[PDB]
Amino acid sequence: DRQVWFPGNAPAPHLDGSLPGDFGFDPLSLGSDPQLLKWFQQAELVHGRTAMTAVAGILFPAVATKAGVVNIPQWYDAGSVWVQNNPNFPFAALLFIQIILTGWVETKRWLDFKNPGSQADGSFLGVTDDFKGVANGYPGGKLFDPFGLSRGSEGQLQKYQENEIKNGRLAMVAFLGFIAQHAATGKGPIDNLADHLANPTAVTFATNGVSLPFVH
Amino acid sequence: FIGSTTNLIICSSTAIFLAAGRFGLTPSANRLASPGLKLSPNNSGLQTGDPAGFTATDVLYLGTIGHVVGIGSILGLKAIGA
Amino acid sequence: GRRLWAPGVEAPSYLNGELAGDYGWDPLGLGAKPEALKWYRQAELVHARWAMLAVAGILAQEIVKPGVFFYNAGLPENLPGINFGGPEGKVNLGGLLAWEFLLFHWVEVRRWQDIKKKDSVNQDPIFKGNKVPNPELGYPGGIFDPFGFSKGNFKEVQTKEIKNGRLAMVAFVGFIIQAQATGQGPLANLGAHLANPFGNNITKNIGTCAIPSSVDVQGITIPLTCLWPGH
Amino acid sequence: KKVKIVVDGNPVETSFERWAKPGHFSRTLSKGPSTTTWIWNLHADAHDFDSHTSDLEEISRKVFSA
Amino acid sequence: TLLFASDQSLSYLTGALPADYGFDPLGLLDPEGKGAGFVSPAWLQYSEVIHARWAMLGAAGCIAPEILATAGVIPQTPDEVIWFKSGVIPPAGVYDKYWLDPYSLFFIEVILVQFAELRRWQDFRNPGSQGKQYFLGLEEVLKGSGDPSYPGGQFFNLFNLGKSDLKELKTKELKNGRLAMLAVFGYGAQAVITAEGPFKNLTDHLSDPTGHNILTNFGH
Amino acid sequence: GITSELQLYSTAIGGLVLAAAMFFAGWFHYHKAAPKLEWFQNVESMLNHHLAGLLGLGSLAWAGHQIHVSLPINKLLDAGVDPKEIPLPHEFILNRDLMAQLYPSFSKGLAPFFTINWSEYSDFLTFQGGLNPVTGGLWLSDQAHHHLAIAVLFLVAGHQYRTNWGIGHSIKEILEAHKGPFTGEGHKGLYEILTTSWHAQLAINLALFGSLSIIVAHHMYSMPP
Amino acid sequence: MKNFTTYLSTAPVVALIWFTFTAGLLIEINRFFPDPLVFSF
Ligand code: CHL
């Protein structure tokens, strides 16, 4: 069959290769229920797209900061810097605005999950065709896909779906690495990369100080 | 130490116990003792090159008992005074 | 092929003499698929010819300028004295990289389109009368074979090319490792071995990395490393 | 006669199916409750392996893993 | 041709296995009863072969740096290339200035050896399954042969040896591996007793056999 | 001999690894490789392994720990040395001279053991009795000698029952031979009871384990270890 | 996964989750608002 995460091991029997990024990886069998599988597919897609946006918004400002062009604060300090530099914008007001806007869009996504195509009735400002949804976790339409990269050809859509899911998984692992590297070095990720590129034989996890708590 | 009393006692005890086991004076893997202390043959199924049925387990236990008896005798003679 | 790389071994079922220099040597089985085999044959051909030109250049430069280390030939003051234009005519290496980047992007994209589809970029794009025959992949011909030396035994001269190219690749690896271990050119290394064979060989130089850790080339610092952790 | 290792390969499938069925081990309790006595009987008979089955081998395996 | 065997041990050990002396006094190679688990006969012969090959690498490798340093081939001192002083046991000593620190080397080793060992394990559990999925084209030579101990092929048997003497070569491999296992055990025991290299122990026994042996080493 | 929170952390982590191994073994020996009934009924082999291998080797290993770790660290502790200045246990393992500074017989090594000059080890294998006046506990050298003697006794005791090499006792024969004039058929049929009824075994073992716990309470108050 | 979620829906597991939530809510209320004796603010 297809390529699997553990060569020589059969894929999970509830994973038949229809979903993008299906490598048969479910050792805990969390996706046995098809409805729970659709829910977890939406979870993986939302997590991966959020991670991709977050990793880009961490990396490109940090790359620009490393070159000396700008002085954008590191990702672990940007909330503090924003609060100290914006006394007229309280934290609670910003949190309330974020919560109501995200609640609107996520409740629309949730109600589409419960009943697909139900947001297509024109109740939101007359939007009908763009809120119908192409597949589970893939809305599409003229609003979410304005360049029409999903409406061209089927094979192009499957290729882009594979690209999206694999880059999303890579970005999720990258954000986990960001957390672990900040907790171990106290520096940004591009700072860590520059330190590794400067002298890679001595700049390792074994020399940060916390991954190996002993002296050695 | 080669001609010492301890080495002589240990070697004599081990050799005597092994020789007693080989010539049927002790219970063996191939012969077992009755509750009335009578030796009768037993099919242990252990292959050995010795024509008298002396096996490797017999060597192990008889050397162990020879070492034990020799060590106890050595410590007793040191306690009493050799 | 018929004569194999070792006595007693067997050739793989996909290697039985289509290509020149076929000794039935694929212990890792990388050429088991024909598309991968075609790609790796193109890679072997270009690697062989580039190492061929490289060994010729390294050997010839030590004849003409024995005082210039070929490992240090990229240094701006080791360049020949020629006018690159501007207020002083000095090198800049940015435009020097740009020339090679543009020209090689063009010619290697042409070769790549040839590799993807056979006889697809044989025609000259500007003067459409000009054409390349391309009898086999990796063997364009035409203006690339002006003297027509492939009109005779093509297989024999292909075998000569691939065997000399393999020798050149091994020799270039030897050149690089010798230059990193001794800090001298290949013919200087040969002369040192001919002077003191038992006192100057691999056993006296393999522990040292004579190349400096970093070098400064007109404002930027290029990090350097040997191919093995010498000191 | 001969002391040796003897096991059975994969006797019981590892599954959560019986986790969802309280009283599965007992012939009387597997049918489900009618009264609240079934709630107490399920906990009282949970480790009485010899009451679940008369096979000494299954009892011994249960005792070993417990 | 026969060590301390028994009627139980000779019932399945007939001589078909390589290096078969019938030496199974704990009857651990009994096929009946031992269906599942690691005391199956197939896994035990496999583990003997794996231990044999690793021990042959270790027995050649725990004494070669000391021998080459004693002979002056390598420039390191013979004391600092002793196998337990090279950084495997940092209480016993660490080698100064490898190109990488030993813990980063252990990280790389964990990744690479896990790749190798898990592919080997999947060949044992599912024979021929490592020749299916794409592995940069290397899956052509990783199909195995149906015998987990003896994969062979274009890489593992790249010189095509054993055309007619494969059983004799298997016997030679197992004999040399058992000797190497005993040698590595001796390396460990002599390291614990004498606190010197195995070659130092050999040269001490060769120079003065009476004053340098297991009896005199326990004396002090 | 534990002197730092790090050593308690290591035991906590190692205990959880062994706890996960025990839960794995329970799943494994029920769902994957469950032993048959004749495996469980090898009471002669079980008694041999649990006397020589569990109790005997356990007592020997703990005597080794006491001698090599507990004795020098507690000797330095009772001498008044600060716990941070006391060397770590592996320093006593690796440096024999540091061991011989406290117990001079360690300079002779293992030679007194193998030449049966056991009286040379009298500095750390003692028979003092009573309590340590500094700490109010039993002498740790006494406990090391106790555990060594117990280990040898249990290793001897674990070679009584016949398993696979002819020698040894059959428990059924011992039970059936012990009958007298007042007691009818005697202990006949008890082997079949104790190899087929888990409840009879549980009754015997619970009685002896509970009596042992009460004896432990009395001996731990009277001779505080 | 269906059988596992059915086991989590059994009465003692549901009771454990619900009482953990209720006890935690009471604990965190008494932590954030220590010593509440009367309804006065
Ligand atoms: C491709 C053939 C080629 C080979 C084999 C060499 C070999 C060498 N050059 Mg040379 N050069 C080559 C082409 C060129 N060089 C130079 C100009 C220089 C200079 C100025 C210097 C060298 C130096 C060196 C030496 C040290 C290299 C090193 O360790 O750096 C470490 C290597 C790296 C950090 C990576 C280098 C290439 C790497 C394999 C990746 C290839 C680059 C890709 C384009 C990456 C793609 C980037 C993407 C993401 C945009 C070594 C003998 C140095 C020297 O030692 O002289 C004393 C030196 O200072 N070369 C130019 C400009 C005209 C070249 C044109 O192609």
Ligand SMILES: CC1=C[C@H](O)CC(C)(C)[C@H]1/C=C/C(C)=C/C=C/C(C)=C/C=C/C=C(C)/C=C/C=C(C)/C=C/C1=C(C)C[C@H](O)CC1(C)C
């Ligand atoms: C068969 C029989 C049968 C019956 O029935 C039962 C019984 C009796 C039990 C049996 C017996 C047996 C035997 C004796 C076992 C033992 C063994 C051996 C020793 C193992 C090893 C084994 C061993 C092996 C693994 C090994 C390996 C080694 C290694 C590689 C090493 C490495 C090293 C190197 C080089 C160098 C550096 O510097 C360091 C290191 C890194 C450290």
Ligand SMILES: CC1=C(/C=C/C(C)=C/C=C/C(C)=C/C=C/C=C(C)/C=C/C=C(C)/C=C/C2=C(C)CCCC2(C)C)C(C)(C)CCC1
């Ligand atoms: C005659 C003959 C021969 C020979 C043989 C021999 C010479 C043998 C030997 C053998 C031997 C000579 C053996 C021995 C053994 C011993 C042992 C096996 C021991 C053991 C010991 C022990 C076990 C100990 C223990 C202990 C300890 C540790 C401490 C405490 C106490 C005691 C003592 C208990 C041959 C075959 C050639 C040929 C034919 C004939």
